[PDB]
Design a protein around this ligand. Structure first.
Ligand SMILES: Nc1nc2c(ncn2[C@@H]2O[C@H](COP(=O)(O)OP(=O)(O)O)[C@@H](O)[C@H]2O)c(=O)[nH]1
Ligand SMILES: [Mg+2]
Length: 168
């Protein structure tokens, strides 16, 4: 039984809490909208193997978190979330990745660039410049919507595979 530590990073309001809940939710609770950072557990199967995912939904750069740096020491991979309708959230990705590289003293850190809210037709961040940013960091790019559940499982499963590929 292999565990995986995942950290969800991004500006405030990009949907990090909403993406993490849609993966985790067993739908016992109708709707649950967290406000405080927290960690959550989910069993998944990737390429034959069972996998326990610890998912930490961090607060944005706006909010203070005492454990912020420790979360990144613990994190094995990272979901970098912006919203495709907030251009500053896209520009903030450079800071969060730079912050990960500082705490982890490394560039080859398993990450996945994630452009949330793919349901809003007010698309300001083109898919092509998002893929370009992902190309420059050497990491996959996945489009998701925590509102329509699309891509949600694909993002997290991609991150776990990055961890696997990095491990060798
Ligand atoms: N249309 C749309 N709205 C979303 C989506 N994800 C989150 N939201 C809304 O964005 C607001 C803030 O999302 P939240 O999960 O708290 O983001 P966080 O600040 O990173 O934790 C909430 O009102 C959500 O309903 C999405 O995928 N599509
Ligand atoms: Mg939140």
């Amino acid at each position: 039984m292999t565990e995986y530590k995942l950290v969800v990073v991004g500006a405030g309001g990009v949907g990090k809490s909403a993406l993490t809940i849609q993966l985790i939710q067993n739908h016992f609770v109708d709707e649950y909208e967290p406000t405080i950072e927290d960690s959550y557990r989910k069993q998944v199967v990737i390429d034959g193997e069972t996998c326990l995912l610890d998912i930490l939904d961090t607060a944005g750069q706006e909010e203070y978190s005492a454990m912020r740096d420790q979360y990144m020491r613990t994190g094995e991979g990272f979901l970098c979330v912006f919203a495709i309708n907030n251009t500053k959230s896209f520009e903030d990705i450079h800071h969060y990745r730079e912050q990960i590289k500082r705490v982890k003293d490394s560039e080859d850190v398993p990450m996945v660039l994630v452009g949330n809210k793919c349901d809003l037709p007010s698309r300001t961040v083109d898919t092509k410049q998002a893929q370009d940013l992902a190309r420059s960091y050497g990491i996959p790019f996945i489009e998701t919507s925590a509102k329509t559940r699309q891509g949600v499982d694909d993002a997290f499963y991609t991150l776990v595979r990055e961890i696997r590929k990095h491990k060798e």
